[PDB]
Amino acid sequence: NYNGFDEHTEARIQKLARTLTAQSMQDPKLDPNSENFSSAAWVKNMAHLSAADPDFYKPYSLGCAWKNLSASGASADVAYQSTVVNIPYKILKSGLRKFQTNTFQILKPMDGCLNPGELLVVLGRPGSGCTTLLKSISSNTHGFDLGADTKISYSGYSGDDIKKHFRGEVVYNAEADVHLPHLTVFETLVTVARLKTPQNRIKGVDRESYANHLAEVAMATYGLSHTRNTKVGNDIVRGVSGGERKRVSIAEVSICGSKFQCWDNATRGLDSATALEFIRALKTQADISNTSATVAIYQCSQDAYDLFNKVCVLDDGYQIYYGPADKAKKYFEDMGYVCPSRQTTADFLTSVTSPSERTLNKDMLKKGIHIPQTPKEMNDYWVKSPNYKELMKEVDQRLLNPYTVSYMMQVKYLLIRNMWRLRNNIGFTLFMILGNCSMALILGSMFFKIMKKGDTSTFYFRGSAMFFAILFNAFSSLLEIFSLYEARPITEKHRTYSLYHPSADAFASVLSEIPSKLIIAVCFNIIFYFLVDFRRNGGVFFFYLLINIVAVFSMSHLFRCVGSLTKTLSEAMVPASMLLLALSMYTGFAIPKKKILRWSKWIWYINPLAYLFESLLINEFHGIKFPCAEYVPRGPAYANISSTESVCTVVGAVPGQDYVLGDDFIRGTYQYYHKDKWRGFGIGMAYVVFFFFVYLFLCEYNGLSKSEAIFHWRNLCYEVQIKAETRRILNNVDGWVKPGTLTALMGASGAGKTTLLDCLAERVTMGVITGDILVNGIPRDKSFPRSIGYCQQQDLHLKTATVRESLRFSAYLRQPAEVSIEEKNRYVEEVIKILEMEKYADAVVGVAGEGLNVEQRKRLTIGVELTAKPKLLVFLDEPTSGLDSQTAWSICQLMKKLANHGQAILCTIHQPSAILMQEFDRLLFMQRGGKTVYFGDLGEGCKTMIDYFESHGAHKCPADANPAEWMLEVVGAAPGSHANQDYYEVWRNSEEYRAVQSELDWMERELPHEFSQSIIYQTKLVSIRLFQQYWRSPDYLWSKFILTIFNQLFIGFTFFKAGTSLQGLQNQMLAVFMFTVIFNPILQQYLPSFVQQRDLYEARERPSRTFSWISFIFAQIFVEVPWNILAGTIAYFIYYYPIGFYSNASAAGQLHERGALFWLFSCAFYVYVGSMGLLVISFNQVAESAANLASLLFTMSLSFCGVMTTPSAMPRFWIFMYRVSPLTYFIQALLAVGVANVDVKCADYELLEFTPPSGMTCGQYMEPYLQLAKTGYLTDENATDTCSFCQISTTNDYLANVNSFYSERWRNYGIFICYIAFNYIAGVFFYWLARVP
């Protein structure tokens, strides 16, 4: 723990400075190695060194003065929920409003002044203008505006000045938690130290040594020298604890040299012991570096108050007082109020602003002197006060009169920072490397057999292999986007400091990743190029590798620009998906350049992958001769042939050749001419450089039912095994609760405050409880956990349901079944009134940022347990934890009211202020380890407990000390307590224990279907809720529908009426191939909803018995399907017709059946997508691991689909996979239903031509072949000089080669339905095994 620059820090700093001086070897008030050295002088001299550079105007120290400060904000107009149907009109009205006044006053006129070195604390209730004031005085005026009369002067330099020249000397920190988790503390501080050394004014020590020493000192001063090698961490990453983490921010901003500061919500979620240390460290900064700071805090302990110089009290956006810290209480007592005996000064100052907690001075009322009682009157009285007449003088007397290190080093140090990040989180990088190695080794094998021959039968596979290689190279980098969004908040923080250019951060992010790219592009490419058996020449292999490197760089730098514009990955999934489809579809292989329609050619002319693939193929085919495989006239009857009487079944063939010159094949099919070898590299570099610079530019510039059971427990014991076998956490605890009483349960950092609720509430999961808990003198049973409420300490609700819906849902599912839905509603009205929330019953629960504020959410969570008509206790857990004083008192009053009505309550409590304590009728206090110390009436003013403890030997209590902490100091439980005896034994022997035991003995003479609803009703209600939750989530549904209506329509139109030529049939097959790649975006969009609702269920709904898991999972299934079916129907309508399938359907006369079945497949595919996305998340904690697994399975299924490589060419092993994947059946059925039963039309360049033998027509020459094989047609039969031949007479002969059939469409449909069903069933089973206890 920390003591505020005690002798230890001085010793450590002297040691470090001695080390610095010794290492430098190549007045005595300053020298490490002399006598009477003083650390403060040394640290202050380093500070001045950092500040007073000869050629910098940076001021020595900044105060602040402000008179008539006035802030107003945009009007709070009415709002409404953004249902899926409302978001269009809402978008329209908002856009019109922005394209083409109404305001409100937030801060009424204020004055003030703050001097170098002082500390200012801005007190006030929530929503009283604290944040607005803090932002105003630091010139961060965004979201509002300052009135014209305002005037601010930072000790000489107007507000506009520091915006132009000294930003960095004025800081604002809404929160001190933003830190990059995976570095160590030293690695977090030393980089900032390096960035800030005045590089031109150090002598006799190298740059790095001075930076290391400055970081070491900056750790030592703020008591962090024991976390030198721990990760800073976050909520989910283990590291330094909360207080230490918040002190890291002060150390960082100390090195950064900010002279003025502001901290808005500084001490969130810090106990009284840690907030004090944080404030003390801030005081040390103000003491040493001569800064000045202002902190706005809630629950300011008296100890933390004594350190502050000045206090600013706010109310309803006014100013009540602003003067020295210790004179505030006297001024407020002279005002007319009286501070109760035990109330702390800060709580007193805050409470006076709340009508209910005040205590007027009766003497003044009796004599008839006006006492202000509303904030306006208080402001008037203050303005009339002499304190203001002094403050105006102290104001007027002040109001009457770029990056340290050059750009290259800003890049260098950030690059090293990124390398450290990688080294501390190396598992993420090895995942990528191993994944790409595995993908290469797998998808290479798939080609391993066919390629060996090298004949003209592998041309299509030589195309597909390049397709896979170029895609899996280009898109292997996108995993780096996560580390961009992770590091954006920290870069935004460091921008506020004049620390480094954002361009520098981006430039370092580009470079730091290069090693991973040039490891993957070597391993993957070597493996793949070896396996697929391309040309062995090294002089072409190196060019292939170069082209892949350029492709990966190009796409990496394009998607960095895409990820820069959008706020978060959730935003980027849609536009990134659309751009990915555009770039991967127009690569020049799915649709060859010859067949691209006019309206989309330009897309091919601006696609870098198109040119790179062109270069790859020109390289791979140019100037190499492939021997033939099969000539078009075949069979024994053709045993005699002249060279000119035969040709190859391939595009570029020439009659009389023993081979085909690959140059001619690429010319014939794709129109790539060998003179275009380097165009691809040239354009690739242009795109890389251009999009890199665009990336940099963008980053630079952008009534209640009574209780009836006297619940009591005796001899209760608790034991666990995890840390050690058979150790005891509750040791013979005993007590009771009587209806109509409010009992509290306090304990130290030791005793199980919580564990004694969970053992009682039957909510523990492990261990053994000994002894008996009794209800009416007989043990609890299976029915118990439905008769007790339990208000979690947290507040977690479905963010789309409104308060009345949240209440009524639980009312329905928890209350007994025999009450009609009419009565439960009047009971919900009872509950709404008794909690006094009738004004906002119809608000949206939302999240903390935009919705119900914390007090309202805690009122709600209590509401949800009353509405279940529990008959036994209503347990709570630390209801006041996290709440400021005023809302804590409000909740305490609510609990007292519920207790008065007749509802028993047993509530844990943590650090309650002295005023709250009186409200709890009883108490149960426990020591380190579950030993009970006290159990009895708390008495009036806590006298009864103080009497007991003082009677048995405890040191007396001060007349104004807080009892709730006094007793914590009486017996252990406090740092350095040293209790004078064991208070467990005194209780064991006391009279009170005898009375309690006698009562329980008399208590044992007092004695004289695990889910309320069925499964069907639970599923009905939960499904209705989940429907309301998809609805009211416009983002999900619309980013689903527009994504589909683009991807499908784009794919449909690019192949608009592809025809029925051989290339046409291949293009239609690929079109059915790109129909499916929409799997991943839709699955990833769907996943978060399930995660949200499952997290709510397993946390709150499961233990409380609200509904059974079966009903939850069936709600998921029964709701996700009706949306996917609609999406599939839309996709069918926009996809089936443009590409021309219906025209094929009419010819065969089967339009109705071939349309209905196609629609059924377009529905089944989306239902399958939903089911697969449910299965993969059934057994995963996180959405991202589920997305990873789903993408991997989809890639594996799609690669072996029999379309990228036909199953004949597949190696022997992988045949099994080609049979078990579902997409093979899907493609076989859909393509067949598309293009079956129609005649083929070979084009002008497809047709094979040659000469017939002399003295016979073409028909007679060819006819025997047209019997040895049973398909093909001749454009002419009476020709004599030459003929033209087309191997395929009907598409039903092409499909058979693709291994699809039109007679097997319904069977494939049946198998696909079977796969959907299996996915759902296995999802349910894996949920039952991986999550249900």
Author numbering: 31 to 56, 92 to 165, 170 to 470, 496 to 796, 861 to 1166, 1178 to 1502
Reproduce, without paraphrasing, sentences from the article in which this PDB structure was first reported.
Pdr5, a member of the extensive ABC transporter superfamily, is representative of a clinically relevant subgroup involved in pleiotropic drug resistance. Pdr5 and its homologues drive drug efflux through uncoupled hydrolysis of nucleotides, enabling organisms such as baker’s yeast and pathogenic fungi to survive in the presence of chemically diverse antifungal agents. In Pdr5, one of the NBS is catalytically active (NBS2), while the other (NBS1) is inactive due to multiple substitutions in crucial residues of all but one motif. Here, we present the molecular structure of Pdr5 solved with single particle cryo-EM, revealing details of an ATP-driven conformational cycle, which mechanically drives drug translocation through an amphipathic channel, and a clamping switch within a conserved linker loop that acts as a nucleotide sensor.
The sample with Pdr5 alone produced a map containing no nucleotide ligands, which we refer to as the apo-Pdr5 state. The apo-Pdr5, ADP-Pdr5, and R6G-Pdr5 are in inward-facing conformations and are very similar; the differences are limited to small structural rearrangements around the nucleotide-binding sites when ADP and ATP are present. In the apo-Pdr5, the arch of the LD2 connecting the TMD1 and NBD2 is not as well defined in the map, and the short helix H17 could not be resolved. This could indicate that ATP binding in the degenerated site has a stabilising effect on that part of the LD, possibly through the contact of E804 with the ribose, as well as an electrostatic interaction of the Q801 side-chain with the triphosphate (at least in ADP-Pdr5). In the apo-Pdr5 structure, the residues of the conserved MQKGEIL motif cannot be discerned in the density, indicating that the motif plays a structural role, perhaps ensuring that the linker domain becomes more conformationally rigid when a nucleotide is bound in NBS1.
